[PDB]
């Protein structure tokens, strides 16, 4: 289908959501990082460090700037490649949750064959997979493909695509 690089607005969302251990819809864009953390500067500084690692540069006041205004500030200098933080988080998701034999490349294959999603939109589905991390490792291959299906539908809903 049409290949799109992941938007900074989705990457930023997923990184915050995963760090706070909350769903993407539970995190509203309107609110600032400092509001969301809830007076815990440690977690604030952990998010800032992860965004600084991922996007390279940060704005001057990232604490008081709302998430939609950070996502727009990053998009000006954001390419579309995942980076050093997203890549490591996905590797830790896949290793820790997929059954012994299922690697990242098998997920990328399954998304290219079953759904036909190219590498740019695979990266997006994998980020939606990260945001809704399951509790315990998926026992079999069939419920692991059923999870990747549920994340493709979620990715397609949020971005606005038909599968």
């Amino acid at each position: 289908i049409a290949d799109e690089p992941v938007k900074a607005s989705l990457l930023l969302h997923v990184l915050v959501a995963h760090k706070l251990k909350k769903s993407l819809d539970s995190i509203p864009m309107s609110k600032t990082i400092k509001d969301l953390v809830g007076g815990k500067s440690t977690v604030q500084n952990e998010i800032l460090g992860d965004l600084g690692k991922e996007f390279g540069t940060t704005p001057e006041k990232p604490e008081e700037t709302p998430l939609e205004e950070l996502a727009e500030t990053f998009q000006d200098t954001f390419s579309g490649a995942l980076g050093k933080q997203s890549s490591s988080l996905l590797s830790r998701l896949i290793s820790s949750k997929m059954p012994g034999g299922f690697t990242i490349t098998v997920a990328r294959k399954y998304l290219q064959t079953r759904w036909g999603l190219p590498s740019g939109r695979q990266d997006g589905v994998l980020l939606v997979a990260l945001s809704n991390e399951p509790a315990a490792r998926l026992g079999s291959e069939a419920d692991a493909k059923a999870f990747l299906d549920s994340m493709a539908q979620k990715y397609a809903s949020i971005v606005g695509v038909d599968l």
């Binding site: 830790r92 820790s96 059954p99 012994g100 034999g101 315990a136 490792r137």
Partner: protein
Amino acid sequence: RQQLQVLARYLKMDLDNGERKFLKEKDTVAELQAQLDYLNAELGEFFVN
């Protein structure tokens, strides 16, 4: 398929040997995955990595 199983039986070529062995290795894998999941639970992601 009935002529193939007759030719297998003659040649003494067990067709299912490969699938039998695969199911033993897949039960070994599922035993080691249970041992690693237990250590990752009693120590935690941060410690084991």
